[PDB]
Amino acid sequence: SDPKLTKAVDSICDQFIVTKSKISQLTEYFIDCMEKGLEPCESDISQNKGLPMIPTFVTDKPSGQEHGVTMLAADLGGTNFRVCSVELLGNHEFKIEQEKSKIPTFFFQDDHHVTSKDLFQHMALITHQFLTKHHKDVIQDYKWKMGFTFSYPVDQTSLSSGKLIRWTKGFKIGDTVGQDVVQLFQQELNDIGLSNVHVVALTNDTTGTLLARCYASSDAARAINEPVIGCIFGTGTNGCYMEKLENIHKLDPASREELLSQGKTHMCINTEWGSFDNELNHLPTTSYDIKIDQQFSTNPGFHLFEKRVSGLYLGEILRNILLDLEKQELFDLKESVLKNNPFILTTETLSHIEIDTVENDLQDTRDALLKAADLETTFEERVLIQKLVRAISRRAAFLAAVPIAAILIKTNALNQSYHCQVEVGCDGSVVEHYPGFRSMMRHALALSPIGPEGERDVHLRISKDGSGVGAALCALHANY
Amino acid sequence: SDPKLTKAVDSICDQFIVTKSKISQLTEYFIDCMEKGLEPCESDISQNKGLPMIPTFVTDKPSGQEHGVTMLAADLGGTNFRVCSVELLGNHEFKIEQEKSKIPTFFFQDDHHVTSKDLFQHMALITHQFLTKHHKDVIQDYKWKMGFTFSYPVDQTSLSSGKLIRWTKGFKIGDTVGQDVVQLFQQELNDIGLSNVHVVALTNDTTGTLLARCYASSDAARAINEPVIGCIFGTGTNGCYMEKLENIHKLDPASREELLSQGKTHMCINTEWGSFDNELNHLPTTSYDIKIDQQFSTNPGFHLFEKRVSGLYLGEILRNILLDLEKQELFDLKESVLKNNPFILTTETLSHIEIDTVENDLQDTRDALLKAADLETTFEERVLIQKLVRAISRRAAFLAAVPIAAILIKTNALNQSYHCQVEVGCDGSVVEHYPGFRSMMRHALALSPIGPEGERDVHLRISKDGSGVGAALCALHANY
Numbered sequence: 001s002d003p004k005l006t007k008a009v010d011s012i013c014d015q016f017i018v019t020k021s022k023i024s025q026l027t028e029y030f031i032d033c034m035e036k037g038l039e040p041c042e043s044d045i046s047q048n049k050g051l052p053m054i055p056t057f058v059t060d061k062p063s064g065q066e067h068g069v070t071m072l073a074a075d076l077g078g079t080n081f082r083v084c085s086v087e088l089l090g091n092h093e094f095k096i097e098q099e100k101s102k103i104p105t106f107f108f109q110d111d112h113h114v115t116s117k118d119l120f121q122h123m124a125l126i127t128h129q130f131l132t133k134h135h136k137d138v139i140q141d142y143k144w145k146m147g148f149t150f151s152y153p154v155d156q157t158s159l160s161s162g163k164l165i166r167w168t169k170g171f172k173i174g175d176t177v178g179q180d181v182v183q184l185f186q187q188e189l190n191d192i193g194l195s196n197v198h199v200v201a202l203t204n205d206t207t208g209t210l211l212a213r214c215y216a217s218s219d220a221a222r223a224i225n226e227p228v229i230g231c232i233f234g235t236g237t238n239g240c241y242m243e244k245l246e247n248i249h250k251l252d253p254a255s256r257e258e259l260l261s262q263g264k265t266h267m268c269i270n271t272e273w274g275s276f277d278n279e280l281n282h283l284p285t286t287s288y289d290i291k292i293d294q295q296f297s298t299n300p301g302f303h304l305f306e307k308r309v310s311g312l313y314l315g316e317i318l319r320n321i322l323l324d325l326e327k328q329e330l331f332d333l334k335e336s337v338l339k340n341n342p343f344i345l346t347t348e349t350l351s352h353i354e355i356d357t358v359e360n361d362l363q364d365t366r367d368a369l370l371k372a373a374d375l376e377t378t379f380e381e382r383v384l385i386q387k388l389v390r391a392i393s394r395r396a397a398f399l400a401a402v403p404i405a406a407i408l409i410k411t412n413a414l415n416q417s418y419h420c421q422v423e424v425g426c427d428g429s430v431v432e433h434y435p436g437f438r439s440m441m442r443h444a445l446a447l448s449p450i451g452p453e454g455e456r457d458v459h460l461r462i463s464k465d466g467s468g469v470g471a472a473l474c475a476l477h478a479n480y
Numbered sequence: 481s482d483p484k485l486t487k488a489v490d491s492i493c494d495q496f497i498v499t500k501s502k503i504s505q506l507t508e509y510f511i512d513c514m515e516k517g518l519e520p521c522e523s524d525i526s527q528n529k530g531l532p533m534i535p536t537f538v539t540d541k542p543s544g545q546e547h548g549v550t551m552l553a554a555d556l557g558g559t560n561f562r563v564c565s566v567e568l569l570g571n572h573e574f575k576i577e578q579e580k581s582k583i584p585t586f587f588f589q590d591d592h593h594v595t596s597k598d599l600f601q602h603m604a605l606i607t608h609q610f611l612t613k614h615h616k617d618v619i620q621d622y623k624w625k626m627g628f629t630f631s632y633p634v635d636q637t638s639l640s641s642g643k644l645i646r647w648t649k650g651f652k653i654g655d656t657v658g659q660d661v662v663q664l665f666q667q668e669l670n671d672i673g674l675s676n677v678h679v680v681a682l683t684n685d686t687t688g689t690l691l692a693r694c695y696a697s698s699d700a701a702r703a704i705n706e707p708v709i710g711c712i713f714g715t716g717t718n719g720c721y722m723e724k725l726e727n728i729h730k731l732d733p734a735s736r737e738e739l740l741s742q743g744k745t746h747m748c749i750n751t752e753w754g755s756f757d758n759e760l761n762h763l764p765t766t767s768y769d770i771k772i773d774q775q776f777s778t779n780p781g782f783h784l785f786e787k788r789v790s791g792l793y794l795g796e797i798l799r800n801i802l803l804d805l806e807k808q809e810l811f812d813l814k815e816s817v818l819k820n821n822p823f824i825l826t827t828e829t830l831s832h833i834e835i836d837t838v839e840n841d842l843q844d845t846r847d848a849l850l851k852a853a854d855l856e857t858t859f860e861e862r863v864l865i866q867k868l869v870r871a872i873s874r875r876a877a878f879l880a881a882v883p884i885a886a887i888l889i890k891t892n893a894l895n896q897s898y899h900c901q902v903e904v905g906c907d908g909s910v911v912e913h914y915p916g917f918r919s920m921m922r923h924a925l926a927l928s929p930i931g932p933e934g935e936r937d938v939h940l941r942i943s944k945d946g947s948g949v950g951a952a953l954c955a956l957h958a959n960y
């Protein structure tokens with residue numbers, strides 16, 4: 001057990017600690033950033049470094065009794081692209097057929113010039129392949145309504161229109177900025193004969209997650225836990241909530257009065273909390289986070305909260321730590337391929353280390369590091385690597401709780417009735433499959449100002465329903 | 481408005497308060513009663529007022545891979561009798577067909593003398609009625625193995641044998657005491673042609689619930705939350721857990737060595753915690769608890785913890801409070817039928833009051849009281865009745881957490897690997913359907929010695945699967 005290396009690792013682990021004080025600071029600061037993000041900004045939305053706090057123009061939570069003919073839904077995530085058909089049967093039930101295809105590496109590389117048409121043509125092709133397989137009879141004649149779930153920040157102008165503010169994650173297609181994604185997708189559908197497919201709704205994967213749970217949640221289960229947040233903890237991270245119309249100052253005052261006159265009280269907000277504190281006024285920052293933001297990410301200066309939490313970057317944090325330990329002549333990389341190989345270590349790699357056992361000489365960690373980049377390790381080295389992984393994930397889980405606590409506090413959602421509890425719809429590989437991530441989230445919520453009495457009233461529920469049901473719900477409401 | 485009556489209600493509600501100190505006292509006392517209950521009992525088991533702590537002779541938790549032909553299962557609960565067929569498909573999957581029939585009130589009356597044959601004859605008839613509907617073809621030829629779930633204290637002698645120690649809940653059939661329930665059921669089955677149906681297993685509904693969760697829990701879900709307790713919070717209350725063979729001193733020393741030699745380490749214990757502190761050394765007691773125990777219950781002196789928790793008695797507590805308030809000329813019963821009508825107020829009546837809202841003038845409370853005993857009430861009266869209900873249920877929920885915390889402490893269940901949690905399998909109408917009951921249970925667990933950090937490592941999961949799957953598992957293991 002090399003003391004020099006052990007002491008260096010323990011020192012790094014301590015930098016990833018998030019104390020109760022920090023959570024209270026970040027929680028309260030988050031609320032401040034929400035109140036400012038809800039003011040009318042007069043500057044380039046694509047360059048605004050504040051909390052976007054984007055109105056989604058969704059004002060009605062599904063009742064669970066919605067029913068209609070089969071709807072279509074397309075979901076472009078951070079890693080995969082999904083097309084599906086959703087049949088809303090009513091009474092919280094639905095029939096779904098979906099096809100999940102991974103996003104070609106061509107779109108995440110810049111060596112070859114990529115354009116919006118390259119992307120939406122491909123999406124149109126996958127849509128045709130889906131309809132041919134699951135709806136071979138009525139592919140060309142039927143009047144399909146499609147809900148488009150676009151997992152990126154969009155300057156929403158209505159339920160069925162909005163321009164891309166800025167790519168995130170691994171996308172850097174330049175010409176898509178400032179263009180209405182619904183039109184770009186509809187044009188490529190028309191250009192392959194699917195003009196009968198009408199994209200009538202545009203939603204974020206957060207908005208879809210919230211609407212999906214309001215429908216699928218049983219009448220009894222929902223009377224207990226009312227869904228108040230729809231959030232994502234996968235390749236990226238984000239969340240939404242219902243905001244009072246009066247507090248949404250970005251909205252046209254006349255439009256606000258119109259909605260109020262129609263009986264509307266709230267509108268869902270796409271917080272884009274991955275961009276929480278982009279200027280790093282209070283977020284923890286290590287030497288490794290700076291490299292990820294400034295060297296290894298596609299969106300330098302933006303989405304810094306995400307780059308400390310989401311699964312796209314957690315693995316890259318460990319890589320930069322090993323490189324730092326090697327630069328200090330403390331860790332031998334052997335014949336590995338970590339150098340000049342960003343993102344070779346993925347969050348999936350870390351999941352095999354999070355709960356590996358010494359009883360097996362940390363063999364799961366061994367195979368995971370060899371499979372990822374041929375990094376040979378000793379037992380004492382794996383013991384220390386596990387400490388780093390558990391430090392990275394714990395910080396991600398603790399920071400993940402801050403936006404949830406802030407929203408619940410600002411909206412006074414946890415104390416509204418006797419025996420009142422709230423549900424937070426969670427989707428994503430990390431929250432769903434990373435061992436202990438949800439457990440540690442609840443730990444941070446217990447340390448946040450809502451306290452353990454608040455954590456016990458919050459249900460972080462895995463929403464496997466999906467944004468497709470939510471997108472289908474928006475399509476069912478819209479006109480063809 | 482009557483201030484006198486309002487002041488009288490606030491004083492009664494304070495009597496139902498359970499403080500953090502009380503929870504710590506009862507938890508520590510419960511562990512003491514467990515340690516004593518595991519010792520060789522020195523008196524007639526039918527009169528022993530201590531914590532029964534009955535060995536169940538179940539020593540193996542299902543792996544989830546069990547598979548076999550269709551099994552039968554009969555479950556005599558506190559209110560209903562259900563017959564079902566369970567097909568264990570393996571890999572945590574199972575197919576179940578069941579028929580739930582209420583236990584005729586005829587068996588809960590003592591005006592006419594009732595005998596065991598009347599009860600088991602009826603149970604045998606329902607078994608025939610079940611097979612006729614779901615297995616009409618091979619009803620008489622097939623060699624059926626049946627697992628019998630008997631939700632009452634049984635001096636278990638083996639997996640397939642045991643004598644009734646004493647009835648509880650509404651049953652008061654005198655000649656059933658001291659008789660083997662498996663034989664009584666098998667004799668009446670033979671007498672109607674179902675001699676090919678062999679009752680090969682006898683289990684308590686607590687044991688069956690625990691075994692069911694060990695099977696149905698996925699490999700991933702169980703690696704996270706290991707089921708360590710199966711408890712019931714319905715018509716009655718009880719729970720079970722795995723105890724080390726060495727600590728079960730009441731068990732035959734030779735039998736322990738045989739089991740230990742076979743690789744066994746624990747044996748499930750039917751605590752019968754409804755009889756926790758029958759002598760009321762520390763359990764809260766009101767003038768109304770005494771009436772239920774000594775006048776309106778079938779088992780005076782026994783099951784006093786249950787008479788404060790389970791749903792069979794909660795409604796009767798409110799009745800005794802309203803009758804007392806009328807005797808004091810503080811509450812007008814009008815032309816109701818509460819007097820001389822034990823158990824006319826049910827816990828289901830209280831469920832409509834727990835979360836009734838003043839914004840609707842407590843209309844649910846109004847309709848619920850009229851339906852129960854034609855008790856007309858004013859708004860101010862319903863406001864006060866709701867305060868009483870919320871005090872009764874909270875005491876039941878806080879007391880309900882004590883046995884769970886004690887078992888977890890004595891067994892050191894929370895001392896596990898990283899990110900390891902435990903599951904408590906919960907079944908019953910109260911824990912499942914009474915508003916807020918589980919929410920308040922988790923609060924008391926946070927006040928117990930395990931603290932809020934322990935409640936977050938404990939998952940009270942509603943196991944609606946049932947003891948049928950658990951009984952079928954014991955039948956699959958046993959020989960025909």
Ligand SMILES: OC[C@H]1O[C@@H](O)[C@H](O)[C@@H](O)[C@@H]1O
Pocket residue numbers: 077078150151152153168169204205206232234235236237238239272274303306
């Ligand atoms: O996929 C999770 C989140 O990733 C972020 O980069 C996007 O801006 C969000 O719209 C999305 O919900």
Ligand SMILES: OC[C@H]1O[C@@H](O)[C@H](O)[C@@H](O)[C@@H]1O
Pocket residue numbers: 557558630631632633648649684685686712713714715716717718719752754783786
């Ligand atoms: O049905 C729940 C519980 O009720 C109690 O009255 C019995 O003594 C227990 O054996 C049973 O498990």
